[PDB]
Design a protein around this ligand. Structure first.
Ligand SMILES: NC(=O)c1ccc[n+]([C@@H]2O[C@H](COP(=O)([O-])OP(=O)(O)OC[C@H]3O[C@@H](n4cnc5c(N)ncnc54)[C@H](O)[C@@H]3O)[C@@H](O)[C@H]2O)c1
Ligand SMILES: [Mg+2]
Ligand SMILES: [Zn+2]
Length: 581
């Protein structure tokens, strides 16, 4: 289409743009898979037109320049990247190229974190650096000493006088999710994924910040080596590092054929959801150091290793709509409907938006291109909007003011992330739990109205509100499973007796959000009657001891919703009774 010269400048500009956001800012806008796609396109163009490769092309360079706000460390041996493949056929082609230019493979989990180079002198940790641009990195020595998995001293015989240990610092998934949940609720930085949370946690001027983040580390390789020797195979070196106290993954594996490599790759992909940390693939390395040294390096990567990538855990797609799911207790979760896309190999077409505050934090509009993440058998999540690709036609996301299931008021209370349907007494989405609550022991306490009886009444649409329970005839109950004429009359009798209650237990039975047994008793004692309570403003409700803004808001919004007032009127009409004050 466009001239090859225009294609080249566009690709180089785009790749550097995202390299800056990823390597320098730990804040990428596009998925790793999209960057990898663009890099493949540039590689294909340069392979067809090798005369157009420049020494500063992204295919010839590593990482990004180190932040000058950090002290800087010149690696004593260059740090590089890895060239990659995405399918078995391409790995086999790499295997053949290697065989024809010289084999045992040392095969390792490819950890999705950031690279670090740790210098030990006489077995003592003396410095540690990020990769930077492969020549100069950022001094993160103080930060690395907060990482328990990285030893400060090596213990053993034959420790070389000077040794750079290289490995990946990374942040397990549970630690990542905690950091992001906290950040969403406090206004801090929300990270795209564990890689970026690990990088941002590590690359702190103040190491006390790093120390509070659950970073860990695995070794994977060697930089400078002086004043001593190491084993003559890569796995041998890793096992020596392990003996000296450095952390080595228990999945490092030898393979004596290309087909063994494929078997390991596929088992690791199968085991991926169980590991507790992100891996973007497996790294496959010529095991013999002599063979590694013969093959050497190109500008960006070794010629003796390949990153065999998995289908990526983040992908981009378009938001076609936003649906608002109503949960069993009235929570309204915004869920994006998406153009279908495979994430980590699994076809998905929705993703959670968490809540209304998160929609606003994202800046999401219908029609946006978004990054979504799926790591495990869970609903995917929207990560961010790809704002640089926002179409000219997008639509505002209007969070519902009324429940999409029952039409009752939706409530959002300041400081609370979750919006809720207020119509707990009528909402179909809440009906099973609301009726079970209503007849429970500390509420109306109806003998024989068990969960399986309630389930049938709801599923057959025989009951829609708690008032309908008192309208049940013995004949209608008899028609249910688990019910006979005797138990049907038993529960009709039990419902008639249950009309005798207290103001506190009736209030508790209504199922207002956050109103526990003690709060119900306090509201009943303060206001004395239902008429006084149902009239109270939020400020009036806040007068009550142990009732704050959240409970006051829920109570006021509950009684302001017409469907609740209608059910309460019906309950009184059916004869529910409590003592006057
Ligand atoms: N989303 C974006 O905008 C964006 C931008 C630039 C780069 N990236 C991502 O960065 C990567 C490309 O750059 P890169 O140089 O960081 O490459 P990489 O992470 O794909 O491969 C090289 C790295 O693998 C790491 N590694 C992990 N486990 C290893 C093991 N067992 N043995 C050896 N090395 C191991 C090393 O730190 C090494 O630097 C791709 O994942 C790319 O998608 C993303
Ligand atoms: Mg990486
Ligand atoms: Zn509702």
């Amino acid at each position: 289409m466009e001239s090859i010269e225009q294609q080249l400048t566009e690709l180089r500009t785009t790749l550097r743009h995202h390299e800056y956001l990823y390597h320098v800012m730990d804040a990428p806008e596009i998925p790793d898979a999209e960057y990898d796609r663009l890099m493949r396109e540039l590689r294909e163009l340069e392979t067809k037109h090798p005369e157009l490769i420049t020494p500063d092309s992204p295919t010839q360079r590593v990482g990004a320049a180190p932040l000058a706000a950090f002290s800087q460390i010149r690696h004593e041996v260059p740090m590089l990247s890895l060239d990659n493949v995405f399918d078995e056929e391409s790995f086999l082609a790499f295997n053949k190229r290697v065989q024809d230019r010289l084999v045992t493979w040392c095969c390792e989990l490819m950890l999705d974190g950031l690279a670090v180079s740790i210098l030990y002198e006489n077995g003592v940790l003396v410095s540690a650096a990020t990769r930077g641009d492969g020549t100069t990195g950022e001094d993160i020595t103080s930060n690395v000493r907060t990482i328990r998995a990285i030893p400060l001293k090596l213990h053993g015989e034959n420790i070389p006088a000077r040794l750079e240990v290289r490995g990946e610092v990374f942040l397990p998934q549970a630690g990542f999710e905690k950091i992001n949940e906290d950040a969403r609720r406090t206004g801090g930085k929300v990270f795209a994924n564990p890689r970026n949370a690990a990088a941002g946690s590590l690359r702190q001027l103040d190491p006390r910040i790093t120390a509070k983040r659950p970073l860990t580390f695995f070794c994977y390789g060697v930089g400078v080596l002086e004043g001593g020797e190491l084993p003559d195979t890569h796995l041998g070196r890793l096992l020596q590092f392990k003996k000296w106290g450095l952390p080595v993954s228990d999945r490092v594996t030898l393979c004596e054929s290309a087909e063994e490599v494929l078997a390991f790759y596929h088992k690791v992909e199968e085991d991926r959801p169980t590991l507790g940390f992100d891996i973007d693939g497996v790294v496959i390395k010529v095991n013999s150091l002599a063979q590694q040294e013969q093959l050497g390096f190109v500008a960006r990567a070794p010629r003796w290793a390949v990153a065999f990538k998995f289908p990526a855990q983040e992908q981009m797609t378009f938001v076609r709509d936003v649906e608002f799911q109503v949960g069993r207790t009235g929570a309204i979760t915004p869920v994006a409907r998406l153009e279908p896309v495979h994430v980590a190999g699994v076809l998905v077409s929705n993703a959670t938006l968490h809540n209304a505050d998160e929609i606003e934090r994202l800046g999401l509009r219908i029609g946006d291109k978004v990054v979504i993440r799926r790591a495990g058998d869970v609903i995917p999540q929207v990560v961010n909007v790809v704002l640089s690709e926002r179409p000219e036609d997008t639509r505002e996301v209007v969070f519902p003011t009324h429940c999409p299931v029952c039409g009752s008021d939706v409530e959002r209370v300041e400081g609370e992330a979750v919006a809720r349907c207020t119509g707990g007494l009528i909402c179909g989405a809440q009906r099973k739990e609301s009726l079970k609550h209503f007849v429970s022991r500390r509420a109306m306490d109806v003998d024989g109205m068990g969960d399986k009886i309630i389930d049938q009444l709801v599923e057959k649409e025989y009951v829609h509100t708690p008032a309908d329970l008192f309208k049940l005839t013995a004949g209608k109950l008899t028609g249910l499973e688990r019910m006979g004429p005797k138990s049907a009359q038993n529960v009709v009798n039990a419902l008639e007796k249950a009309k005798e209650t207290t103001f506190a237990r009736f209030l508790y039975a209504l199922g207002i959000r956050e109103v526990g047994e003690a709060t119900a008793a306090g509201l009943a004692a303060y206001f004395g009657t239902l008429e006084a309570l149902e009239a109270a403003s939020i400020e009036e409700l806040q007068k009550v001891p142990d009732v704050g803004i959240v409970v006051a808001s829920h109570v006021h919004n509950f009684f302001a919703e017409e469907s609740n007032r209608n059910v309460i009127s019906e309950l009184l009409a059916e004869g529910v009774h409590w003592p006057a004050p």
